[PDB]
């Protein structure tokens, strides 16, 4: 009753598609086409399903790199350096939701969870008839994956001030 | 702040050779035996260019021709970082840069490509130094005055710091010293800002409270004449006993509260117009009720109209996030297996079935015509309510017109109207006065607000006064002077036992001679000027290292220190290098010195903490001869 | 004779056409939902019922929006729900103890008008005026709270009726 | 200003012998050879002491050892003056001096006595400069002396500019010396600046006072809207201010006969306003909630900041995916994910946990260092908008409550033609406070007055003239210096030079970059630049009328960059000095303390040097040194 709205608006059947796009975009720009580490999968929804950070991801275009996205938060004209630290806390808060999204993702043959703390994305699948609004979250997830691809673990952890 | 240089790197312009690397050592005196030629060194230009300089001072004759990219490696509290800048080429300056980070850099890319721009690197350095917070704080570049001693400044008695030849630069540095000394801090700036805001708030609060208190008090003074006037009007049944403020006030509230006033007019005698006037008054009292009810109904109807549309929007915003569960149904396979081990498991199928069922329910709820019927009925009722309100207003107009005509005809009607008008307005004035007097009671929030704001101002004043920016500075300078003296006990000077002082405003040293105090400008020979420069700068860097969060990078560059001597003299230079070594070893790897000098290996050979390798030769020779011959 | 009947059917249509899931039993017929029925048990005027409907709808929209902004999650509402339940139990007991003598509908009016005015604890938030009433109306629609100590028996009587 | 030094005179410490004497030629370069590194620097100490310097520095070891009274004879436009000072020897400085004046003082007293104090002679000199009793005589000593430290120094150009106060004074003086601004206008400009900075503060205080709190706006707006609904006043097509509202309400009150004209339109308008208030309230409440939660999280992170350690770094918990997985696993199910139950599932869970924990350990090995973070700017800003929005929310709620409550029982009877009176009976009372709030006149008058004074002073000073004249004078000085440099030895005798006032130095305009004298080597060039600039300035000061700077110059060892070819360069500088002196009809005097060979000079026009004038210990007569 007091949770129907939230349960409908944050259902894992959307997180699964978001993670699928994130992996498919991470493999493309990886140096040796290796699929991403497992921990980074937990950082997809806590950034795309929060409006104030999704707008930042939307503004700086592709060739800016993750560093520009991180820097926008500390800009004097914006002054939102606190949200950067809160990204990690919010990611902690939503462990179960992302976990279920990953479960649905693999069980639908969208990702193969190798026995190496790694997840191979899959090609040859396309949806149709979706709404315009989600059709932007999908591209945002893909762009974020591409940004994550170009860098290494240590650089990403330092840039987003995450603690794994 | 831990920030040191590990090495320099060059990328040959001709794409047939490996990049050339010159590797320094952390936490020791790096004696680069070089500069043995006319012209300037090639190291300082590169370091300055890589850290975001606006111009290229690199020798264009013999270096800029052979290499395409320049770079340095810096060890910082966040690990190691490689910075690189593209060779300007046909323009005096350029902004392309490349950045890399790691725990310990070990591989240098053969090919470099643009990664960022100079402004980004300046922002990065500012953040690394804590200089992006709320004069107060400098920028990174302004700190150069503490870490560089050019050739014509290292033994010059009329100049002590790099970049102090213009009015603007001198004022900048003079404003900056207070922050670097640790007197000013971010928290004090924030506290000052907050205290100013609180004071500005309290001013206005007190002003308005005082005005309201005046207005209420002057009326509470006239309360007695007001009460006598009330008794005259007959609204208050006149008492004859003595009454205090409480009794008169109370009586006034009961008078106000009545559904009607005590008309001091007899009813046994009725004229022709009195009954008509009373009937009209009662009829208007009646119509008021219907009009109010219609108003209430119309308001609620509009509010419902808004709520319905908002809920309509919510439904679609809820459906468009669930729709995708329909597509996830078509890709799931006939079998059902565990995500981890592949064991038979249908949980995902149940989840997708539940979601598709919810989607179906929501889509059914969005039925159009079933809902589109409701607006028709809603509109049908809105018009009825509006027309009824219009009729009520028309009746009110008619009754008012009749009352006006009747009171115009007779005479007693006019007198009765005058009496009622006077009594009503008197009651209204008393009502407002009593309300405003209620607001300003002892427990009224309007008093506690001011009291708490005063308390906050008191506390903030106490805090900001508990730690002053002058005593901090004066206590900081004492230890710097003492350390400088201790260092100076070892070097060569005319009078080692005379303490010195550093003058913040003057930007120089002041030797406290027994008979007189002499500025550094009036002490002879370079052997003394070099000693004083060394002592002051080393003591300053020790201080900056012994304190937390200071933004001064912990490395120092000394260009050609021994030129005062011709590059009997061995002992003095040996003592200088030995003092440098002692200071650097005492800091346990947190302080780096880079020295460019000609002095042979026999003066700094066997000194602890001093290292110099013969491969580092600078100026031209750092370019491999292979490139010099190929190009 | 005719305006009264058209008015009543318009009232039924306006009042009873929506729910979390339109029940097919109440689809062809306009049986009022549980909360509106619980209100009509005490016989509140018509405009007050309209106000209650608006409160419920607006609260639903607000919860949808806050969830869709990522500002709230599942676990946020559970403490609020249990707090509402506990508070309503305490106030129901107190109202029953204090004014057992009054007519039962009077007790319903009382509880209905005290439960809404009292504040409720929650997070660092500024709930507008029309939020708590909507949550209470959702709870009532589920027959977890009531505006009558024996609302359940009158509700069986109404469904029979 | 005509001012030159004609002679120096000494008296023995023991009053048993006649005074000694040295005299220079007036209006001619005077070269004083001697013995270097023999304490020969006595002329400058003597002159500085005689002219009222605050501390004595005459050589106690050799000269003061035998003499106790000193003095100098100077020829000024008022005539000729002998100024003498006393050197008791037990104190650094003394106030006792003797003064004599005449049209020409040939006689020399054999004994001296107190005749004037330091303050009196300083007043006399300041008056002699024709200054306003702010410039002074001593302050002008930056255009006459050139010690050994400064004559060929590429860092310092003018004497007495090492400290901060001295250069501050000199930077204030230059505009006066250049003749750009007269004495009175400097006094006016100080007042103008003070008023300029004061007026802005007063205007800010006016603006601060004019504001008013929230609920007091709310009450007025509520009352006006209620009056509007009854039909007493017309609908305002544009948002009104407090002034218009109060004026219209006063007009309504004074009406002799009210006439309510409530109509459907009037009722509908109030409800529309109510809807708008609803929307604004919901929006602002959402924003306030967002800010409040943001602030709470920031505060919690600060709690993790300071209670961890004094350093600006946090204490925070880790994500611990593997630990959280294995903790959430219970005996009822082998799979946190799917809830299944199988031993193979347990083994797979353990293996995945171990691999993920290995990855976690690797990254933790990478990430061990602390995580400092400073976010005071955001904290302050957030705390600002929290209050700024709370106020507005309270105002909106208060406004809405009245509109909505005007449909309850409270207004069953208000629409009648009778109780409307009571409403007026409130409005006319309420205004008694509203007229008093948010208004003041005194500040307005003060602001207008200050603005008018500012306009008057600005019209009087006309600060364009000073800049124009200063620029033209600088152009003239630069041109003269460029012309003079042709006769000297420099690296490039064609590049024009410029004088920088604020920097107090020279700037040589290079081919692409203009270089300060500091960053140019070839030490012999600095001497040429110094000579050029100083001589140009002194030639300019005589070209005007009533200039304060005395007309004489002192140089100390200009040739020290040419250890005693060199003999071909020194002569160029000396003959340029002579030419400049000759070109001034004897109005300008130079004194030089130098030790070059006599064969380098003497044959030039305008130069003079006599075999006597030996200084140092040889300054004292040989008759003395035994019984004095």
**Residue matched to tokens 């109370």:** B250
Q: B120 vs A16: CB contact, 8 Å cut-off?
A: no
CA distances from B70 to B73, B258, C100, D249, D511 (A): 11, 92, 90, 77, 28
Identify the H or E element spanning D133. Answer: none
Give the alpha-carbon dihedral of B256, B259, B264, B269, to 10 degrees.
170
Count CB neighbours of A49 within 10 A. 22
Q: Is B388 helix (H, G, I), strand (E, B) or coil?
A: helix
φ, ψ for residue D179, nearest 5 deg = 75, 10
Q: Alpha carbon C136 to chain centroid distance?
A: 5
Q: How far apart are alpha carbons B302 and D407 in whole angstroms?
A: 14
Q: How far apart are alpha carbons B22 and C104 in whole angstroms?
A: 94
Identify the experimental approach.
Answer: cryo-EM
Token pair listed for C106:
């009077």
DSSP string, B170-197: HHHHHHHHHHHTTSS-HHHHHHHHHHHH
Q: Which of B427, B426, B454, B439 is nearest to B211 (CA)?
A: B439
For B455, half-sphere exposure in the C-beta direction (CA atoms, 13 angstrom radius) is 6
Q: D359 vs A39: CB contact, 8 Å cut-off?
A: yes
Neighbors of chain C by Cβ distance (3+ pairs < 8 Å):
A, B, D
Print burial letters for B20-40: b (CB count within 10 Å at least 16), e (below 16): bebebeebbbbbbbbbeeeeb
Q: Alpha carbon D55 to chain centroid distance?
A: 31
Q: Which of B608, B541, B542 is nearest to B574 (CA)?
A: B608
φ, ψ for residue D385, nearest 5 deg = -65, -25
Q: Write out chain D residues lying below 8 Å of A80, CB-based.
A: 378
Do the beta carbons of residue D171 and residue D501 sit within 8 Å? yes
DSSP collapsed to 3 states, chain A: CCCHHHHHHCCHHHHHHHHHHHHHHHHHHCCCCCCCECHHHHHCHHHHCCHHHHHHHHHCCHHHHHHHHHHHHCCCCCCCHHHHHHHHHHHHHCHHHHHHHHHHHHHCCCEEEECCCEEEECCCCCCCCCCCCHHHHHHHHHHHHHHHHCCCHHHHHHHHCCCC
Q: How far apart are alpha carbons C110 and A1 in whole angstroms?
A: 26
Nearest to A163 among D318, D338, D373 (CB): D318
- Taking the Cβ of residue A89 and every Cβ of chain C, the question of whether any pair is shorter than 8 Å is answered with no
Token pair listed for B436:
């405003």
CA distances from D357 to A83, A164, D88 (A): 28, 10, 91
Give the alpha-carbon dihedral of B347, B351, B353, B354, to 10 degrees.
130
Print burial letters for B109-119: b (CB count within 10 Å at least 16), e (below 16): eeebeebbebe
Q: D274 vs B339: CB contact, 8 Å cut-off?
A: no
Extents of the domains making up chain A: 12-160
Q: How far apart are alpha carbons A18 and A22 in whole angstroms?
A: 6
Strands (E), D501-618: 505-509, 514-516, 552-556, 589-593, 607-608
Neighbors of chain A by Cβ distance (3+ pairs < 8 Å):
B, C, D
Q: Which of D579, D573, D582 is nearest to D555 (CA)?
A: D573
Count CB neighbours of B398 within 10 A. 11
For B490, half-sphere exposure in the C-beta direction (CA atoms, 13 angstrom radius) is 18
**Residue matched to tokens 């005490």:** C42
Q: Supply the DSSP symbol for D594.
A: -
Q: Write out chain A residues lying below 8 Å of D359, CB-based.
A: 37-39, 117, 164
Token pair listed for C123:
């997070």
Tell me which residues of chain D, numbers 248 to 307, contact chain C at a CB-CB cutoff of 8 Å. 281-282, 285, 288-290, 292-293, 295-296
Q: How far apart are alpha carbons B131 and B140 in whole angstroms?
A: 7
DSSP string, D164-213: HHHHHHHHHHHHHHTTSS-HHHHHHHHHHHHHHHHHHHHHHHHHHHH---
Q: Alpha carbon D331 to chain centroid distance?
A: 76
Q: How far apart are alpha carbons B177 and D94 in whole angstroms?
A: 40
Q: How far apart are alpha carbons D126 and D133 in whole angstroms?
A: 8
A14: Cβ–Cβ under 8 A, 6 or more apart, which residues?
A: A101, A134, A137, B321, B324
- Distance in angstroms between the alpha carbons of the first and the last residue of chain D: 40
Could you tell me which chain D residue has the CA closest to the CA of C63?
D286
Q: How far apart are alpha carbons D427 and D224 in whole angstroms?
A: 9
Q: Calculate Rg over the CA atoms of chain B.
A: 45
Token pair listed for B268:
């046994």
Do the beta carbons of residue D541 and residue D580 sit within 8 Å? no
CA distances from D106 to D4, D5, D7, D83, D467 (A): 16, 15, 11, 14, 47
Q: How far apart are alpha carbons B189 and B59 in whole angstroms?
A: 45
Q: How far apart are alpha carbons D497 and D143 in whole angstroms?
A: 19
Q: D363 vs A86: CB contact, 8 Å cut-off?
A: no
Q: D338 vs A103: CB contact, 8 Å cut-off?
A: yes
Interface test with A, best of D297, D305, D313, D328 (most A CBs within 10 A): D297
- Interhelix angle C104-117/C76-98, rounded to 10 degrees, is 140
Do the beta carbons of residue B453 and residue B198 sit within 8 Å? yes
Report resolution (Å) to 1 decimal.
Answer: 3.2
φ, ψ for residue C97, nearest 5 deg = -65, -45
Domain at B3-130+551-630, CATH from 3.30.1660, 3.30.200, 3.30.70, 3.40.50: 3.40.50
Length of chain A: 164
Tell me whether residue D443 is exposed, middle or buried, using C-beta atoms within 10 angstroms of its C-beta: 0 to 12, 13 to 18, 19 or more: middle
Count CB neighbours of D35 within 10 A. 13
Q: B331 vs A68: CB contact, 8 Å cut-off?
A: no
Count CB neighbours of D46 within 10 A. 24
CATH assignment of D1-130+596-628? 3.40.50
Q: Is D333 helix (H, G, I), strand (E, B) or coil?
A: coil
Q: C81 vs A2: CB contact, 8 Å cut-off?
A: yes
Do the beta carbons of residue A19 and residue A103 sit within 8 Å? no
Q: How far apart are alpha carbons B185 and B189 in whole angstroms?
A: 7
Question: Within chain B, how many helices (H) and strands (E) appear?
Answer: 15, 14
Strands (E), D397-504: 497-500
Q: Write out chain D residues lying below 8 Å of A116, CB-based.
A: 355
Handedness of CA D338, D339, D344, D350 (dihedral sign): positive
Q: Is B603 helix (H, G, I), strand (E, B) or coil?
A: coil
Q: Write out chain D residues lying below 8 Å of A42, CB-based.
A: 319, 321
Tell me whether residue B368 is exposed, middle or buried, using C-beta atoms within 10 angstroms of its C-beta: 0 to 12, 13 to 18, 19 or more: exposed
Q: How far apart are alpha carbons C61 and C71 in whole angstroms?
A: 14
Q: How far apart are alpha carbons C59 and B623 in whole angstroms?
A: 74
Q: Calculate Rg over the CA atoms of chain A.
A: 15
- Distance in angstroms between the alpha carbons of the first and the last residue of chain B: 42
Q: Is B157 helix (H, G, I), strand (E, B) or coil?
A: coil
Q: How far apart are alpha carbons D497 and D520 in whole angstroms?
A: 13
Query: Quick one: chain B helix, strand, coil %, rounded to 5?
Result: 55, 10, 35
Q: A2 vs C67: CB contact, 8 Å cut-off?
A: no
Token pair listed for D608:
């003079």
Q: Which of D615, D557, D592 is nearest to D62 (CA)?
A: D615
Token pair listed for D427:
């409005």
Token pair listed for B58:
């690199």
Query: Quick one: chain D helix, strand, coil %, rounded to 5?
Result: 50, 10, 40
D610-614: which pairs have CB atoms within 8 A and are 24 or more residues apart?
D612/D22, D613/D22, D613/D30, D613/D32, D613/D33, D613/D34, D614/D33, D614/D34, D614/D35
Do the beta carbons of residue D117 and residue D92 sit within 8 Å? no
φ, ψ for residue B9, nearest 5 deg = -140, 145
φ, ψ for residue B47, nearest 5 deg = -60, -40
Q: How far apart are alpha carbons D275 and B356 in whole angstroms?
A: 38
Nearest to C13 among B314, B317, B377 (CB): B377
Q: Write out chain B residues lying below 8 Å of C7, CB-based.
A: 381
Q: Calculate Rg over the CA atoms of chain C.
A: 17
Q: How far apart are alpha carbons D163 and B508 in whole angstroms?
A: 9
Q: How far apart are alpha carbons B498 and B489 in whole angstroms?
A: 10
Q: How far apart are alpha carbons B591 and D408 in whole angstroms?
A: 79
Could you tell me which chain C residue has the CA closest to the CA of D279?
C128
Extents of the domains making up chain B: 3-130+551-630, 188-217+448-466, 274-409
Nearest to B307 among C7, C21, C54 (CB): C54
Q: Write out chain C residues lying below 8 Å of B307, CB-based.
A: 53-54, 57-58, 61
Q: Write out chain D residues lying below 8 Å of A156, CB-based.
A: none
φ, ψ for residue D414, nearest 5 deg = -70, -30
Token pair listed for B438:
């209620």
Q: Is B347 helix (H, G, I), strand (E, B) or coil?
A: helix
**What does the angle CA D622 – CA D627 – CA D628 come to, to the nearest 5 degrees?**
80
Token pair listed for D334:
């082998």
Token pair listed for D381:
């800003």
Q: Alpha carbon D327 to chain centroid distance?
A: 65
Q: D292 vs C124: CB contact, 8 Å cut-off?
A: yes
Q: Write out chain A residues lying below 8 Å of B322, CB-based.
A: 8, 11, 13
Q: How far apart are alpha carbons D124 and D130 in whole angstroms?
A: 10
Token pair listed for B198:
């609180």
Q: How far apart are alpha carbons B152 and B533 in whole angstroms?
A: 12
Q: How far apart are alpha carbons C64 and C58 in whole angstroms?
A: 10
Token pair listed for D87:
């050197």
Count CB neighbours of D99 within 10 A. 15
Handedness of CA D91, D94, D100, D101 (dihedral sign): positive
DSSP collapsed to 3 states, chain C: CCHHHHHHHHHHHHHCCCCCCCCHHHCCCCCCCHHHHHHHHHCCCHHHHHHHHHHHHHHHHHHHHHHHCCCCCCCHHHHHHHHHHHHHHHHHHHHHHHCCCCCHHHHHHHHHHHHHHCCCCCCCCCCCCCCHHHHHHHHHHCCCCCCCCCHHHHHHHHHHC
Q: Calculate Rg over the CA atoms of chain D.
A: 44
Q: Write out chain C residues lying below 8 Å of A49, CB-based.
A: 70
**Residue matched to tokens 């498919």:** A24
Q: Which of D562, D594, D601 is nearest to D579 (CA)?
A: D601
Identify the H or E element spanning D542. Answer: helix D524-542
Q: C60 vs B314: CB contact, 8 Å cut-off?
A: yes
Strands (E), B369-476: none
Tell me whether residue B293 is exposed, middle or buried, using C-beta atoms within 10 angstroms of its C-beta: 0 to 12, 13 to 18, 19 or more: middle
Q: C21 vs B361: CB contact, 8 Å cut-off?
A: yes
Give the alpha-carbon dihedral of D527, D530, D534, D535, to 10 degrees.
40
Q: Write out chain D residues lying below 8 Å of B156, CB-based.
A: 155
Q: Which of D176, D184, D164 is nearest to D140 (CA)?
A: D176
Token pair listed for D203:
């205007």
Q: Which residues pair with D83 in a beta bridge?
A: D72, D99
CA distances from D59 to D40, D44, D66, D89 (A): 10, 11, 11, 11
Could you tell me which chain A residue has the CA closest to the CA of D358?
A117
Could you tell me which chain A residue has the CA closest to the CA of D335?
A103
Do the beta carbons of residue B613 and residue B577 sit within 8 Å? no
Q: C126 vs D393: CB contact, 8 Å cut-off?
A: yes
Tell me whether residue B273 is exposed, middle or buried, using C-beta atoms within 10 angstroms of its C-beta: 0 to 12, 13 to 18, 19 or more: middle
For B128, half-sphere exposure in the C-beta direction (CA atoms, 13 angstrom radius) is 23
**Residue matched to tokens 């700068």:** B537
φ, ψ for residue A74, nearest 5 deg = -90, 5
A143-146: which pairs have CB atoms within 8 A and are 24 or more residues apart?
A143/A25, A143/A57, A143/A62, A144/A22, A144/A25, A144/A44, A144/A47, A144/A48, A144/A57, A145/A21, A145/A22, A145/A23, A145/A24, A145/A25, A145/A26, A145/A28, A145/A29, A145/A36, A146/A25, A146/A26, A146/A28, A146/A29, A146/A62
C37: Cβ–Cβ under 8 A, 6 or more apart, which residues?
A: C31, C155, C158
**Phi-psi domain of B341 (left: phi exceeds 0; alpha: psi -120 through 50; beta: other):** alpha
């Amino acid at each position: 009753m007091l949770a129907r709205e939230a349960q409908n608006i944050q259902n894992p059947a959307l997180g699964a598609a978001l993670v699928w796009r994130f992996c498919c975009g991470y493999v493309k720009t990886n140096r040796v086409s290796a699929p991403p580490p497992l921990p980074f999968l937990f950082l997809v929804l806590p950034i795309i399903l929060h409006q104030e950070t999704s707008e930042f991801v939307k503004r700086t275009y592709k060739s800016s790199g993750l560093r520009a996205f991180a820097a926008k938060f500390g800009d004097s004209s914006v002054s939102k350096q606190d949200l950067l630290f809160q990204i990690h806390e919010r990611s902690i808060r939503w462990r179960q939701l992302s976990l279920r999204s990953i479960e649905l993702a693999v069980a639908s043959d969208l990702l193969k969870l190798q026995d190496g703390s790694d997840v191979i994305p899959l090609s040859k699948t396309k949806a149709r008839g979706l709404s315009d609004e989600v059709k932007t979250l999908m591209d945002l997830a893909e762009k974020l994956g591409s940004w994550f691809g170009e860098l290494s673990i240590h650089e990403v952890v330092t840039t987003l001030k995450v603690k794994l | 702040m831990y920030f040191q240089i590990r090495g320099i790197i060059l990328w040959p312009r001709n794409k047939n050779f490996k990049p050339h690397t010159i590797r320094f050592e952390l936490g020791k005196v790096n004696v680069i035996s070089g500069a043995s030629r006319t012209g300037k060194s090639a190291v300082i230009p590169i370091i300055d260019y890589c850290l975001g300089a606006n111009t290229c001072s690199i020798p264009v004759k013999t270096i800029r021709k052979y290499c395409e990219w320049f770079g340095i490696v810096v060890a910082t509290e966040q690990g190691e970082k490689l910075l690189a800048r593209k060779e300007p080429g046909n323009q005096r300056s350029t902004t392309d840069m490349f950045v890399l980070e790691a725990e310990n850099i070990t591989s240098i890319p053969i090919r470099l490509e643009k990664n960022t721009n100079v402004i980004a690197v300046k922002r990065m350095l500012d953040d690394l130094a804590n200089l992006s917070n709320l004069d107060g704080r400098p920028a990174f570049r302004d700190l150069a005055a503490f870490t560089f001693q050019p050739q014509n400044v290292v033994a010059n008695p009329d100049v002590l710091f790099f970049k102090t030849n213009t009015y603007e630069h001198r004022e900048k540095l003079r404003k900056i010293f207070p922050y670097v000394l640790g007197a000013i801090t971010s928290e004090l700036m924030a506290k000052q800002f907050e205290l100013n805001r609180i004071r500005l708030f309290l001013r206005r609060k007190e002003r308005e409270l005082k005005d309201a208190q005046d207005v209420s008090a002057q009326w509470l003074a006239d309360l007695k004449s007001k009460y006598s006037e009330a008794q005259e009007l007959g609204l208050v049944p006149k008492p004859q006993e003595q009454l205090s403020r409480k009794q008169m006030i109370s009586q006034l509230e009961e008078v106000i509260s009545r559904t009607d006033l005590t008309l001091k007019v007899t009813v046994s005698t009725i004229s022709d117009a009195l009954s008509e006037l009373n009937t009209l008054e009662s009829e208007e009292r009646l119509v008021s009720r219907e009009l109010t009810t219609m108003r209430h109904r119309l308001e609620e109807m509009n509010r419902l109209r808004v709520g319905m549309h908002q809920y309509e929007n919510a439904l679609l915003m809820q459906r468009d996030r669930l729709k995708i569960s329909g597509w996830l149904l078509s890709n799931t396979n006939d079998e059902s297996d565990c995500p981890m081990c592949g064991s038979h498991t249908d949980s995902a199928k149940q989840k997708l079935q539940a979601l598709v069922q919810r989607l179906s329910d929501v889509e059914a709820a969005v039925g159009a015509d079933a809902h589109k019927e409701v607006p028709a009925a809603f509109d049908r009722e809105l018009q009825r309510v509006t027309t009824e309100v219009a009729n009520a207003t028309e009746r009110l107009r008619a009754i008012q017109s009749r009352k006006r005509t009747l009171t115009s005809r007779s005479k007693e009607a006019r007198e009765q109207q005058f009496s009622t008008r006077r009594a009503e307005r008197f009651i209204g004035n008393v009502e407002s006065a009593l309300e405003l007097h209620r607001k300003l009671g002892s427990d009224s929030e309007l008093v506690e607000e001011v009291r708490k704001l005063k308390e906050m101002v008191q506390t903030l004043e106490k805090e900001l006064r508990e730690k002053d920016v002058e005593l901090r500075k004066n206590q900081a300078l004492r230890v710097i002077n003492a350390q400088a003296g201790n260092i100076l006990q070892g070097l060569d000077v005319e009078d080692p036992s005379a303490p010195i002082s550093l003058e913040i405003n003057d930007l120089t040293i002041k030797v406290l001679g027994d008979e007189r105090d002499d500025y550094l400008s009036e002490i002879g020979s370079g052997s003394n000027w070099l000693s004083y420069h060394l002592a002051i700068l080393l003591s300053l860097h020790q201080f900056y290292l012994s304190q937390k969060n200071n933004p001064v990078p912990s490395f120092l560059i000394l260009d050609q220190p021994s030129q005062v001597y011709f590059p009997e003299d061995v002992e003095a230079v040996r003592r200088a290098f030995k003092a440098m070594g002692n200071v650097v070893i005492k800091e346990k790897g947190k302080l780096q010195l880079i020295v460019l000098d000609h002095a042979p290996r026999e003066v700094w050979g066997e000194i602890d903490g001093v290292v110099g390798l013969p491969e580092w030769r600078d100026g031209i020779k750092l370019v491999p001869m292979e490139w010099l011959t190929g190009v | 004779w005719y305006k009264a009947y058209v008015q009543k059917i318009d009232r039924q249509m306006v009042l009873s056409s929506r729910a979390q899931a339109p029940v097919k039993e109440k689809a062809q017929e306009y049986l009022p939902d549980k909360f509106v029925q619980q209100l009509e048990i005490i016989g509140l005027p018509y405009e007050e019922i309209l106000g209650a409907i608006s409160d419920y709808l607006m609260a639903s929209f607000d919860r949808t929006d806050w969830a869709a902004r990522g500002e709230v999650d599942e676990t946020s509402f559970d403490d609020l729900d249990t707090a509402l339940q506990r508070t309503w139990k305490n106030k129901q007991r107190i109202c029953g103890l204090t004014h057992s003598e009054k007519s039962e509908q009077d007790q319903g009016k009382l509880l209905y008008f005290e439960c809404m005015q009292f504040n409720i604890p929650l997070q660092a938030m500024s709930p507008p005026s029309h939020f708590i009433p909507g949550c209470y109306h959702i709870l009532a629609d589920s027959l977890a709270v009531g505006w009558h100590p024996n609302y359940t028996t009158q509700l069986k009587n109404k469904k029979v009726a």
